[PDB]
C-alpha cells in the first residue's frame, strides 16, 4: 500500500489551480460563504480529477475554438472535439464566476494577440453546449488564456466575487455532471483556500482548494485513501515548529478551526501526520 | 535512501518548461545543433534547480518590473529586488533565443493588457544588470507573460531558432552563473527534447529538456542520485509494451539511441541505475 504524501515544497513556490498564478497567501472564506463548487482544482486524495480539472497548469483557465464572428465553437485544448450535453465545459475552461473575463487570444501560424471580453451571464454563454458568444472576435481558430478580470457586466454595479463559478448552462438546459459542492464536515471547521493575486482594476484574490502541484502529485501517487481524513501539520521551515493542525478530506480539500489561518506565513509546508476520524476535533490555528 | 522515481503520468498531459504550453511531441535536435544551454527547465535528478528554473509553471516565461518609459527595471515575480552581476535574469525570465518576443503585460490594480515587443539582441537588453528597453511601454509596474514569438529583428532575415538562448549580458560584460551547457554524451546517443507548439506567424516548435511537472516532482522527492545514469523505459499505457530504452543523467536530461515518431501518450518509468557508458538498445530495436 503506497503511503499518502503531499509535496515536499513550500506553498510560496506553488501555483493556484484556477489560474496560472503564484500562491501568495492562505485564507478562509468570508462568513457568508459556507460551501463552494469550483470546477478546476478538484482532485480526490487518491488522485481522481473531477470537473474540468487538468493534470497540468499549462491547461488551466484556457480556451480553444473556432469563431465564425458570432459564436466560438469550443474544442478541447489539443483540438479534440468537445461533445455537448456531457459536462460543464472542456477540460481547463475558466471557472471564475462573479466577474467579466478578459482572455488573451493567439493563433498557431498567425501574428498578434486579441483581447476577448467575456460576459458569462447571458444565454449566449453556453460552454456546456460547446458554444460561447464571439463578441467581436473575427473568424478563425484561436487559443486563449485568461489574462485579467473586471467587475461583472450583470447585474450592473455588482462587485467581483471569485467564490462563485459561472453559469455553464442556459435557459435551454442546465449544465450536467458538474463537480459537486464541498463543505467543512467537522465541528467549528471552515474551508482553507490558497490565494493568488489576479490582475485587474481591483485588489483581486483568487481562492482555490488545492495548489496545482498538489494535484499533479496526487494524480501521480494515487495513494489509497485508507482513512476518513488526513491529519496534517503546517510546518515552518525555519524553526521546524508546527504552526497548526489541518484536516484533508478524501474529496480533496482542507479544513481548519480558526483562532488566525489568514495570518499564517506562506513559506511553510504541509506534512501528512496520520489518518484520523472524520470528526477529529482540531485545535484552533495558533491557540 | 529514498528511491528515484518519475511521475506516473502520461507525457501528453504535461507541460513544457520554457513556456506554459502542452507537450505535443518528442524530438531530437537538428544536425546544426550540438549543445544547448537552456536556462529554464534545468533540474538535477536529486531535485536541484539551476539557471532561472522555477519549481512551478506559474513562474515560467514571465517578467516583472517597473517601466519608466525608457527601461523596465526588472524584479523577481513577487517584487523582490533582482541584483545585477549575479545571474542571467530573475527566476522564470524567458530563455527563448533566436526570436523576437511579444509579451502580454497586465497590472495589479489597473485595467487592460498591453503587448510588449522585445528585441533581445541590442545593447539595451541586459537582464543580467536588471533592465531591458521599455520599447514604448508607459511608466508603471507590470507583470507579463510570453504570448507569441516572431522572427528576430536582427540579424535581418534570420529565422526563428528556439535552440538558442538570448544574450543576457552586453558587450560591456558577459552574463555570469548561467546554467552550463548540455552536450550529447556519445555512443550514438542524442539528447531528447519535449516539444510544444508556440503561437506566432510560423510553425514554431519549442524544445525543452524536462516537463515542468518532472521538475516539481524531483525538487520535492530529492532522491539521492545513487548511480551514474538512470535507465528508463517509455511504456505504452494500452499494451504495457516498452517503446524504448532511455537514460536520464544526473545533470537532468534524457538521451536515447535512435524518437520523433514515438507516441506522446506514454509514461517514463525508472528501471535501475546503470553506468554512464551503458549501451542503449536503439529505440524500437
Amino acid at each position, epitope marked *: 500500500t503506497r503511503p499518502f504524501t503531499l509535496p515536499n515544497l513550500p506553498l510560496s513556490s506553488l501555483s493556484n489551480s484556477r489560474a496560472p498564478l503564484p500562491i501568495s497567501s492562505i485564507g478562509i472564506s468570508p462568513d457568508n460563504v459556507q460551501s463552494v463548487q469550483f470546477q478546476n482544482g478538484r482532485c480526490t486524495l487518491d488522485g*481522481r480529477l*473531477v*470537473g474540468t480539472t487538468p493534470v497540468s497548469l499549462s491547461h488551466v483557465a484556457k480556451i480553444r475554438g473556432t469563431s465564425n464572428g458570432t459564436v466560438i465553437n469550443l474544442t478541447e485544448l489539443d483540438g*479534440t472535439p468537445f461533445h455537448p450535453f456531457e*459536462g460543464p465545459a472542456p477540460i481547463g475552461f475558466p471557472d471564475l464566476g462573479g466577474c467579466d473575463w478578459h482572455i488573451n487570444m493567439t493563433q498557431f501560424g498567425h501574428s498578434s494577440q486579441t483581447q476577448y471580453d467575456v460576459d458569462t451571464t447571458p444565454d449566449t454563454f453556453v460552454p456546456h453546449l460547446g458554444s460561447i458568444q464571439a463578441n467581436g472576435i473575427g473568424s478563425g481558430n484561436y487559443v486563449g488564456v485568461l489574462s485579467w478580470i473586471s467587475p461583472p457586466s450583470h447585474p450592473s454595479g455588482s462587485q467581483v466575487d471569485l467564490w462563485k463559478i459561472p453559469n455553464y448552462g442556459s435557459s435551454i438546459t442546465e449544465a450536467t*455532471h458538474l463537480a459537486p459542492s464541498v463543505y467543512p464536515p467537522g465541528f467549528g471547521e471552515v474551508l482553507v483556500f490558497f490565494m493568488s493575486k489576479m490582475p485587474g482594476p481591483g485588489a483581486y484574490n483568487l481562492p482555490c482548494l488545492l495548489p496545482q502541484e498538489y494535484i499533479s502529485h496526487l494524480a501521480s501517487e*494515487q495513494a489509497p485513501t485508507v482513512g476518513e481524513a488526513a491529519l496534517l501539520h503546517y510546518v515552518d521551515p525555519d524553526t521546524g515548529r508546527n504552526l497548526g493542525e489541518f484536516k484533508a478530506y478524501p474529496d480533496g480539500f482542507l479544513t481548519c478551526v480558526p483562532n488566525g489561518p489568514q495570518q499564517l506565513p506562506i513559506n511553510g509546508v504541509f506534512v501528512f501526520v496520520s489518518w484520523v476520524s472524520r470528526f477529529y476535533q482540531l485545535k484552533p490555528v495558533g491557540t | 535512501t529514498r528511491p528515484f522515481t518519475l511521475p506516473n503520468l502520461p507525457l501528453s498531459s504535461l507541460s513544457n518548461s520554457r513556456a506554459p504550453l502542452p507537450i505535443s511531441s518528442i524530438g531530437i535536435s537538428p544536425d546544426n545543433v550540438q549543445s544547448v544551454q537552456f536556462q529554464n527547465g534545468r533540474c538535477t535528478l536529486d531535485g536541484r534547480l539551476v539557471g532561472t528554473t522555477p519549481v512551478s509553471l506559474s513562474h515560467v516565461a514571465k517578467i516583472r518590473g517597473t517601466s519608466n518609459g525608457t527601461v523596465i527595471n526588472l524584479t523577481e515575480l513577487d517584487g523582490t529586488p533582482f541584483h545585477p552581476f549575479e545571474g542571467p535574469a530573475p527566476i522564470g525570465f524567458p530563455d527563448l533565443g533566436g526570436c523576437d518576443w511579444h509579451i502580454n503585460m497586465t497590472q495589479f490594480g489597473h485595467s487592460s493588457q498591453t503587448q510588449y515587443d522585445v528585441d533581445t539582441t541590442p545593447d539595451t537588453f541586459v537582464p543580467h544588470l536588471g533592465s531591458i528597453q521599455a520599447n514604448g511601454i508607459g511608466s508603471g509596474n507590470y507583470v507579463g507573460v510570453l504570448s507569441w514569438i516572431s522572427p528576430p529583428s536582427h540579424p535581418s532575415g534570420s529565422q526563428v531558432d528556439l535552440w538558442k538562448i538570448p544574450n543576457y549580458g552586453s558587450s560591456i560584460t558577459e552574463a555570469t552563473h548561467l546554467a552550463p551547457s548540455v552536450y550529447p554524451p556519445g555512443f550514438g546517443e542524442v539528447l531528447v527534447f519535449f516539444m510544444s507548439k508556440m503561437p506566432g506567424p510560423g510553425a514554431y516548435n519549442l524544445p525543452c529538456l524536462l516537463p515542468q511537472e518532472y521538475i516539481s516532482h524531483l525538487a520535492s522527492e530529492q532522491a539521492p542520485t545513487v548511480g551514474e545514469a538512470a535507465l528508463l523505459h517509455y511504456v505504452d*499505457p*494500452d499494451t504495457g509494451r516498452n517503446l524504448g530504452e532511455f537514460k536520464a543523467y544526473p545533470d537532468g536530461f534524457l538521451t536515447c539511441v535512435p524518437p520523433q515518431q514515438l507516441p506522446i501518450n506514454g509514461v517514463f518509468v525508472f528501471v535501475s541505475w546503470v553506468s554512464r557508458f551503458y549501451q542503449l538498445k536503439p529505440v524500437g530495436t
Partner: nanobody
C-alpha cells in the same frame, strides 16, 4: 464526474445469449478503462472483462474468456458485454465499472476502479 447506466439483463435459458450495455456519460474525455464485474449470491464481486477505453487491449477472466466479449460502440459512448453459451453459474448481478485515473493496462482489482453502475441482474435458468 462519470455516470454509468446499465441495461440488457433479464431471464435467459441455459445455452442462450444475452448482451448487456452500459451508457457512459459525463467526463469521458479521460476515461481510460471500462470493465464488467459480477457478484453472485454468497460470493465476492469478481472481474469479468475489461478494455482500454480508447485503445485496443482487452482482458477477460479465464472462466468466461471463450464465451464473453467486451466492446465499445463505434457511435455512442456505450460499452457492451456479449454473453454467449450462458450457464446457470453465470447467474449474478452484473456491474459496469469505469477507471479514469492513469494506469498501464487493464486492471482486475475492484478497488482500482473509480466509477460503478447500479448493476443489472442476469438469471440463467435450466
Amino acid at each position: 464526474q462519470v455516470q454509468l447506466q446499465e441495461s440488457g439483463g433479464g431471464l435467459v435459458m441455459t445455452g442462450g445469449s444475452l448482451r448487456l450495455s452500459c451508457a457512459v456519460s459525463g467526463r469521458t474525455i479521460d476515461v481510460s478503462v471500462m470493465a464488467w464485474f459480477r457478484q453472485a449470491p454468497g460470493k465476492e464481486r469478481e472481474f469479468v472483462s475489461g478494455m482500454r477505453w480508447s485503445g485496443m487491449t482487452t482482458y477477460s477472466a479465464d472462466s468466461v474468456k471463450d464465451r464473453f466479449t467486451i466492446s465499445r460502440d463505434k457511435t455512442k459512448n456505450t460499452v457492451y458485454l456479449q454473453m454467449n453459451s450462458l450457464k446457470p453459474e453465470d447467474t449474478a448481478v452484473y456491474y459496469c465499472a469505469a477507471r479514469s485515473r492513469f494506469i498501464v493496462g487493464v486492471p482486475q482489482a475492484r478497488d482500482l476502479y473509480d466509477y460503478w453502475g447500479q448493476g443489472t441482474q442476469v438469471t440463467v435458468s435450466s
